[PDB]
């Protein structure tokens, strides 16, 4: 986007400066966010993804609901900065354009430098599903259909595979069989809900850590900072999408496979701080699929990456044509380790599972 263009959307909203730049900024995948420096404060631009998220008007309202019900407990979160006409967000020439206030004093990651880091993460998210389960699910519509729907991803990634349109799937048949060969465990948590024995709760549904802001000084969680995808689902998509980012000795798309691991150590953190918020709902079946719930969402991850490489990349940003490719490998590296240490985590699960 030009400059001149971007200068223009941020002339439509109540900004308190003089803009000075506007910058390409974070490692969101799906949405274009910006840096707006100004002579006074920071604020974060977006552009809506309108093919993944068509409903604008109700995906605003949610998090409208979520951010107002935050505000209204005297919790930080993300603070909406209207446009001039008092609106929550502004379409701008075929556009959806939202504007948060800078979060300050923050750090994030997006790999875990230590286990304490992790900790705080799990405790962060752990509270926050406490805090969601305040709603009703009929508050909170949806804003992408069948999201951690694995066996609806499988469907997805299965066409894909079969269209095979840019003929790179030649260059990953391990990837692709990998994928083919697990489709019989992909269903586990769909199950569950389908049948009642697994309940359904508002959930984050996007659980990575760089979600979660830290404080510069103290180190505990300042707010949670994508709240797009909030909806109805299983407290196990978001521990399972933590482990899958943040268990990782390596970034999601590290081209190095020789670094990429699964720390049952950094299991047990996230574990720790998660299940510590959560110990008065959590129930048995939730519990017995905890680290699984891992292997769930980083094969669901994974496939889509796949999926995507397979489309020509049409659904996450890439930097370069292999981008997806790398990304999937590193997920199906860490399903591979996750396999292989079920019965530690099982056992930590298990030990943790007696406060
Ligand atoms: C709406 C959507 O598809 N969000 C994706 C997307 O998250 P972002 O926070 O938007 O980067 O990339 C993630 C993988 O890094 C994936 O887990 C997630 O489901």
């Given at each position: 986007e030009?400059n ?5 959307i941020?002339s ?5 400066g ?5 910058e ?19 604020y974060?631009?977006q ?11 109700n ?19 993300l603070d909406?900065?209207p ?7 502004a379409?701008?020439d075929?556009g ?9 004093h923050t750090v ?13 993460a ?6 926050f ?6 709603f ?14 694995t066996?609806?991803?499988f469907?997805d990634?299965?066409?894909?595979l079969?269209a095979?349109?840019?003929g ?8 692709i ?15 569950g809900?389908?049948?009642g ?15 979660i ?6 180190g ?16 196990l ?8 980012f943040?268990?990782?000795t ?13 720390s049952?150590e ?11 918020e959560?110990?008065?709902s959590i ?6 699929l905890?680290?699984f719930?891992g292997?769930?969402?980083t094969?669901?991850?994974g496939?889509?990456f ?17 981008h ?16 292989q ?11 943790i599972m007696?406060?």
């Open positions: 030009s001149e263009v971007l200068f223009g941020a439509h909203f109540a900004l308190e003089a803009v000075t730049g506007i390409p900024y974070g490692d969101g995948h799906i949405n274009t966010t910006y840096l707006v420096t100004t002579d006074g404060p920071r974060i631009l552009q809506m993804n309108t093919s993944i998220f068509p409903d604008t008007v995906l605003m309202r949610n998090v409208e609901l979520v951010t107002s019900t935050l505000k209204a407990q005297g919790k930080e979160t909406i900065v446009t001039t006409s008092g609106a929550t967000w379409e701008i075929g959806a354009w939202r504007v948060y206030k800078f979060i300050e994030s990651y997006n790999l875990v430098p230590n286990p304490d880091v992790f900790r705080e799990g405790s962060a998210f752990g509270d599903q406490n805090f969601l389960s305040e009703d699910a009929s508050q909170l519509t949806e804003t992408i259909a069948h999201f951690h729907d066996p609806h991803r469907e990634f299965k066409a894909a079969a095979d349109k840019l790179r799937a030649a260059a990953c048949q391990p990837e069989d990998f994928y083919l060969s697990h489709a019989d465990q992909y269903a586990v948590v769909m199950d809900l389908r049948d024995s697994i309940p359904l709760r508002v959930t984050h549904n996007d659980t990575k850590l760089n979600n802001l830290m404080d510069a000084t103290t505990k969680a300042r707010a949670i900072i994508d709240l797009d995808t909030i909806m109805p689902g299983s407290m998509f978001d521990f399972g999408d933590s482990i899958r943040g268990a990782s390596a970034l999601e798309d590290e081209k190095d496979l020789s670094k990429v691991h699964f049952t950094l299991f047990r953190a996230y574990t720790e701080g998660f299940v510590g959560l110990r008065g129930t048995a079946r939730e519990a017995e905890l680290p719930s292997n769930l969402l094969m669901e991850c496939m889509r796949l999926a995507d490489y397979l489309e020509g990349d049409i659904y996450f940003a890439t930097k370069y044509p292999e997806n490719l790398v990304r999937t490998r590193t997920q199906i590296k860490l399903v591979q380790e996750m396999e240490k079920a019965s530690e985590t099982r056992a930590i699960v298990a030990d007696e406060a």
